[PDB]
Write a protein that binds this ligand. Structure first.
Ligand SMILES: CCCCCCCCCCCCCCCCCC(=O)OC[C@H](COP(=O)(O)O)OC(=O)CCCCCCCCCCCCCCCCC
Ligand SMILES: CC(C)CCC[C@H](C)[C@H]1CC[C@H]2[C@H]3CC=C4C[C@@H](OC(=O)CCC(=O)O)CC[C@@]4(C)[C@@H]3CC[C@@]12C
Ligand SMILES: CC(C)CCC[C@H](C)[C@H]1CC[C@H]2[C@H]3CC=C4C[C@@H](OC(=O)CCC(=O)O)CC[C@@]4(C)[C@@H]3CC[C@@]12C
Ligand SMILES: *[C@@H]1O[C@H](CO)[C@@H](O[C@@H]2O[C@H](CO)[C@@H](O)[C@H](O)[C@H]2NC(C)=O)[C@H](O)[C@H]1NC(C)=O
Ligand SMILES: *[C@@H]1O[C@H](CO)[C@@H](O[C@@H]2O[C@H](CO)[C@@H](O)[C@H](O)[C@H]2NC(C)=O)[C@H](O)[C@H]1NC(C)=O
Ligand SMILES: *[C@@H]1O[C@H](CO)[C@@H](O[C@@H]2O[C@H](CO)[C@@H](O)[C@H](O)[C@H]2NC(C)=O)[C@H](O)[C@H]1NC(C)=O
Ligand SMILES: *[C@@H]1O[C@H](CO)[C@@H](O[C@@H]2O[C@H](CO)[C@@H](O)[C@H](O)[C@H]2NC(C)=O)[C@H](O)[C@H]1NC(C)=O
Ligand SMILES: N[C@@]1(C(=O)O)CCc2ccc(OCc3ccccc3-c3ccccc3)cc2C1
Lengths: 464, 471
């Protein structure tokens, strides 16, 4: 029993489009208007984040066709830099990165779905936490049931969020067509543009939050049918669509609201809904909830496969990377992902763990590209279906290095505790991997709890 | 394989009865715990308090109004036309005012009734094309224009000694002209010289609302007594009435508290306007140490604050001689007052005061920013409570938004606060520690939580503390 090969091209487009378009297009625009001062600089920030993500994803497309194995961005560091830094990337991805980005989007789903019951109010926070946990547990059950069901869910909710954004787009177009064009006249357009890269960088960080997940199809390769045509085709179809929809949606936001409205607001989407429909204005936050539901599904689907592939290499315990027969789904990895996500419901505010750790994210992203360039020279024994032009990785590495170095500058005490946490995985590594010839007291207990979990979930190892 | 069993060995051992029972029992336990969490979320939602409906506000509920009596003295000599006013809307947008009461501009000769036409603009201000350019120029800056219409604004008696009949029937025809010209409201002043004035105001209020519900009518008296004011508002309930009911006094704050609370009691907490007169400045009634304390009070009471031009800089007719007390010159720059070239200073102009963060105009801007933005200052609820000998202390709270607590010391000797409320409802009881937004006098730190049993106040100080909706 191995996993399968049943993800087609449209399923890959759905995975990428649905996982990228989550909550950032409804939450972050205040954060980029606040710290870039002007509508003009804000819209340029959105376009700059767009082209940055496009360049990085093309580098990942040729990376993923070179080393065509699952668990991307961890398999690529394991191929180049070896066991220990790959374990450090896996340990931070397992403990912080994945089960915070899932829980944030689940919480946004809950609040924007309960918003039509408490219009001019804060929604009660315990009900929001409970509905978020319900979302996560239900999508875990659907993913444990079958792989085709999860892809059908992804298709439906990707289509739903695309129609929901096309509505907000053409409403702001017909607002222009009514001929009362208050903002976006090409004379004002730019006042308040401050200067001082030291704060616009932080604005850039907010924009990059809306582009997270541009490399998740790399994590879920080895499930694709013909992943030599289909993976670069899926990336190159998926991302220009996303950056186009993002700049048009920010424009349609700017056609209706004034600037200090958008700085003083807590939800730009419900303002757009109230202004333009009034009655039947409960439509917009329902569709925001549907968006966040779809992206939580996509992130669970890729995180399970990452922890699967990490268990096959001997970095994680052996009960992960066991497949349940018949069903043919990696059940204990999905259970582990769900539990790690639900543990973040004890956070008072986890939207501040971002900017504690973005430097490590872009560090490993740039390290994979450096390793790709090194592998282009010190291994010309590989076949490359797409060999991208060089200096596109060089400029991408320079941009990532710029981002890291300016993160160390403005907030060094932010990056310090992040460095302590990312080296806190080192005793874990030595205790787990380096200590073969373990004491005999522990091997029997590990075998016992592994065979107990197997007898519970009915999962067998991978072999065929 | 690696640290566990293989395929056929497990399918041998993990297929026995009892293990199948344990698996189905765990599946049923999962799907029951999920429904338990769903029911818990539902009973948390339906046991929550609903929120109040917003009171469907108008445009004159949002911020302050700005009265420009004399046009020729607002800019200066020569450029005292309606076209010159168009260059000042960026300053009025800096003040965040929402309205603009332009002075009477129509063709009025003198006590000759027959040569007074309320439909023709006097040539000294411009003509109609300048006016309707000004209207849309203000409209694009989101500033409404209210047009004063007092007929005899050059003579002594403002309402034409002669019978009011002809006068009052030409005022009626003026409204239906200037409304479809495009103005947003009207103001009639000095209605104590109008015989049976209570009956004429209802007809004009009918006509003004019979055009749109986004229209305003302001009336002005010089009456400072409560019973004569209440007789104007017996049939009219949506009339803004400015009067000198507040000015007259101000030596002690327990007399100001009684005035405000008696006015709100006698009218049943309806929407009102707060002023010190119908056309004068603040400095015509107050000494110059009390101008910050009154600007803190007028921006936090439940109504619409109305100011004249120059109350944001503390303009004074008794500081520059050889000048009318009814139309002083607005001190824009140092060169603004030509005669006696050197009597002005730097702290007396808008150009000089736009830098100093402890100036009067710097206080006006922050207060007019807070008033048009926060909900509990927009349509909140008012509750005054008892305090020390000379204090005026009250609280504004809407539903669940951030409450506000204003403490004013009208006295001269400094004193402790003694904020013993004990009568405020439980939705608005004050905590032990509250923030601080501003103070009228410098020498405090804006932002740190200060605690409300050792709160002391210096001479003529006011405080704008803050706390959120909690237990
Ligand atoms: C959370 C429950 C999900 C259900 C699936 C069970 C998964 C349990 C394993 C969780 C792994 C946690 C991350 C470990 C990070 C270190 C990895 C490493 O160093 O290499 C491993 C290394 C690989 O050795 P190998 O498995 O012999 O190849 O093995 C170990 O060193 C194991 C020691 C760490 C185990 C810590 C487990 C703490 C959580 C236990 C949760 C309960 C499990 C039993 C449930 C049923 C009880 C009735
Ligand atoms: C917010 C509401 C409107 C939608 C939330 C999702 C639904 C509540 C749940 C309930 C049942 C779930 C799924 C249950 C099983 C499948 C069957 C599936 O078809 C299959 O059986 C293919 C799998 C196979 O047989 O191999 C198509 C729909 C789907 C995803 C269902 C779609 C809807 C799901 C994810
Ligand atoms: C509750 C958590 C913390 C502990 C982990 C227990 C598992 C989540 C439970 C829930 C349902 C259980 C199992 C019930 C029996 C099997 C066989 C399977 O039987 C079939 O339907 C075979 C399908 C076919 O015939 O084609 C049904 C689901 C499955 C994988 C389940 C896998 C997961 C189990 C062990
Ligand atoms: C406009 O004014 C007229 C008369 O001033 C109002 O009509 C009547 O007013 C008297 C009070 O003086 C009421 O007793 C009658 O019931 C009114 N007639 C009605 C309502 O048909 C009239 O209400 C005013 N217009 C508006 C819109 O209120
Ligand atoms: C409002 O101002 C007038 C002008 O000083 C005050 O005096 C009245 O003046 C008119 C004509 O000028 C007379 O017909 C009245 O008889 C005067 N009033 C009295 C009481 O004699 C008027 O008193 C002022 N109003 C108040 C309430 O003080
Ligand atoms: C102002 O409001 C107070 C209540 O807050 C009124 O005081 C009460 O009036 C009724 C009848 O007049 C008395 O039976 C109560 O004993 C009064 N209570 C208190 C605490 O004084 C007061 O009447 C209102 N003012 C006016 C003019 O009606
Ligand atoms: C503008 O600033 C000058 C200089 O500080 C003020 O002149 C002071 O006035 C106060 C009382 O008015 C005196 O106690 C000081 O001794 C004066 N100092 C000097 C150097 O002249 C002037 O009053 C200020 N103008 C206003 C309107 O506040
Ligand atoms: N686009 C999403 C939306 O909600 O709009 C939807 C899905 C998704 C998936 C992965 C992801 O990566 C996380 C990340 C990305 C960029 C910058 C910092 C972080 C970060 C760093 C530390 C801890 C948590 C997050 C972000 C997002 C946001």
């Amino acid at each position: 029993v191995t996993l399968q090969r049943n993800i087609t091209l449209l399923n890959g487009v759905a995975i990428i489009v649905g996982t990228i378009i989550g909550s950032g297009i409804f939450v972050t625009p205040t954060g980029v208007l606040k710290e870039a001062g002007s509508p003009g600089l804000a819209l340029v920030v959105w376009a700059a984040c767009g082209v940055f993500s496009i360049v990085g994803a093309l580098c990942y497309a040729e990376l993923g066709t070179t080393i065509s194995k699952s668990g991307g961005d961890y398999a690529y560091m394991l191929e180049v830099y070896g066991s220990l830094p790959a374990f450090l990337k896996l340990w931070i991805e397992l403990l912080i990165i994945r089960p915070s980005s899932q829980y944030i989007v689940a919480l946004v789903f809950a609040t924007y779905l309960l918003k039509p019951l408490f219009p001019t109010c804060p929604v009660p926070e315990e009900a929001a936490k409970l509905v978020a946990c319900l979302c996560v547990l239900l999508l875990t059950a659907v993913n444990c049931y079958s792989v085709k069901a999860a892809t059908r869910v992804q298709d439906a909710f990707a289509a739903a969020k695309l129609l929901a954004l096309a509505l907000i787009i053409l409403l702001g177009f017909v607002q222009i067509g009514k001929g009362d064009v208050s903002n976006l006249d090409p004379n004002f357009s730019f006042e308040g543009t401050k200067l001082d890269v030291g704060n616009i960088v932080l604005a850039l960080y907010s924009g990059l939050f809306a582009y997270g997940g541009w490399n998740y199809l790399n994590f879920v390769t080895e499930e694709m049918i013909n992943p030599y045509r289909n993976l670069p085709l899926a990336i190159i179809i998926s991302l220009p669509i996303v950056t186009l929809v993002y700049v048009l949606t920010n424009l349609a936001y700017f056609t209706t609201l004034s600037t200090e409205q958008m700085l003083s607001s807590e939800a730009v989407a419900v303002d757009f809904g109230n202004y333009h429909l009034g009655v039947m204005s409960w439509i917009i936050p329902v569709f925001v909830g549907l968006s966040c539901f779809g992206s939580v599904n996509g992130s669970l689907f890729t995180s399970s496969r990452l922890f699967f592939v990490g268990s096959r290499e001997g970095h994680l315990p052996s009960i992960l990377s066991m497949i349940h027969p018949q069903l043919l789904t990696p059940v204990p990895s999905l259970v582990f992902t769900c539990v790690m996500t639900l543990l973040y419901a004890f956070s008072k505010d986890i939207f501040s763990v971002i900017n504690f750790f973005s430097f490590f994210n872009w560090l490993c992203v740039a390290l994979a590209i450096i390793g790709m360039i090194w592998l282009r020279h010190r291994k010309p024994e590989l076949e490359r279906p797409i060999k991208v032009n060089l200096a596109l990785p060089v400029f991408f590495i320079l941009a990532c290095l710029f981002l890291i170095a300016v993160s160390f500058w403005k907030t060094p005490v932010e990056c310090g505790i992040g460095f302590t946490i990312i080296l806190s995985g080192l005793p874990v590594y030595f205790f787990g991997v380096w200590w073969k010839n373990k004491p005999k007291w522990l091997l029997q207990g590990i075998f016992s709890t592994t065979v107990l979990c197997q007898k519970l979930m009915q999962v067998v190892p991978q072999e065929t | 394989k690696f640290t566990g069993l293989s395929k056929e060995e497990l399918l041998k051992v993990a297929g026995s009865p009892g293990w199948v029972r344990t698996r189905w029992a765990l599946l049923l336990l999962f799907w029951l715990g999920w429904l338990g969490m769903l029911a818990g979320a539902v009973v948390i939602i339906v046991r929550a308090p609903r929120c109040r409906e917003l009171p469907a506000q108008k445009w004159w509920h949002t911020g302050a109004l700005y009265r420009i009596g004399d046009l020729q003295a607002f800019q200066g000599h020569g450029a005292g036309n309606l076209a010159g006013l168009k260059g000042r809307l960026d300053y009025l947008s800096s003040l965040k005012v929402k309205g603009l009461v332009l002075g009477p501009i129509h063709k009025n000769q003198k006590d000759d009734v027959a040569q007074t036409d309320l439909l023709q603009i006097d040539p000294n201000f411009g003509s109609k094309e300048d006016f309707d350019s000004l209207l849309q120029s203000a409209k694009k800056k989101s500033i409404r224009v209210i047009l004063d219409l007092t007929p005899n604004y050059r003579g002594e008696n403002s309402w034409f000694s002669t019978q009011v009949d002809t006068v009052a029937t030409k005022v009626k025809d003026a409204l239906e002209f200037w409304l479809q010209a495009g103005v947003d409201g009207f103001q009639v002043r000095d209605i104590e010289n109008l015989k049976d004035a209570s009956s004429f105001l209802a007809e004009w209020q009918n006509i003004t609302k019979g055009f749109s519900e986004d229209r305003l009518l302001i009336a002005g008296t010089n009456s400072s007594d409560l019973q004569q004011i209440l007789s104007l508002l017996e049939s009219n309930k949506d009339l803004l009435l400015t009067s000198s009911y507040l000015s007259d006094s101000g030596s002690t704050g327990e007399h100001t508290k009684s005035l405000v609370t008696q006015y709100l009691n006698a009218t049943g907490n309806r929407w009102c306007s707060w002023s010190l007169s119908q056309a004068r400045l603040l400095t015509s009634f107050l000494p110059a140490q009390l101008l910050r304390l009154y600007q803190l009070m007028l921006f936090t009471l439940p109504g619409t604050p109305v100011f004249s031009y120059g109350d944001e800089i503390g303009l004074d007719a008794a500081a520059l001689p050889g000048q009318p007390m009814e139309a002083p010159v607005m001190l824009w720059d140092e060169s603004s007052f030509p005669d006696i070239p050197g009597a002005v200073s730097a702290n007396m102009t808008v150009k000089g005061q736009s830098e100093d963060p402890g100036s009067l105009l710097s206080l006006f801007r922050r207060l007019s920013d807070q008033r048009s933005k926060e909900r509990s200052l927009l349509h909140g609820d008012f509750h005054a409570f008892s305090a020390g000998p000379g204090l005026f202390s009250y609280i504004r709270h809407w539903d669940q938004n951030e409450r506000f607590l204003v403490v004013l010391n009208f006295g001269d000797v400094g004193l402790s606060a003694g904020l013993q409320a004990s009568d405020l409802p439980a939705s608005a009881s004050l905590p032990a520690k509250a923030d601080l937004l501003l103070s009228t006098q410098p020498g405090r730190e804006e932002g740190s939580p200060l605690e409300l049993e050792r709160l002391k106040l210096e001479p003529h100080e006011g405080l704008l503390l803050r706390f959120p909706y909690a237990a």
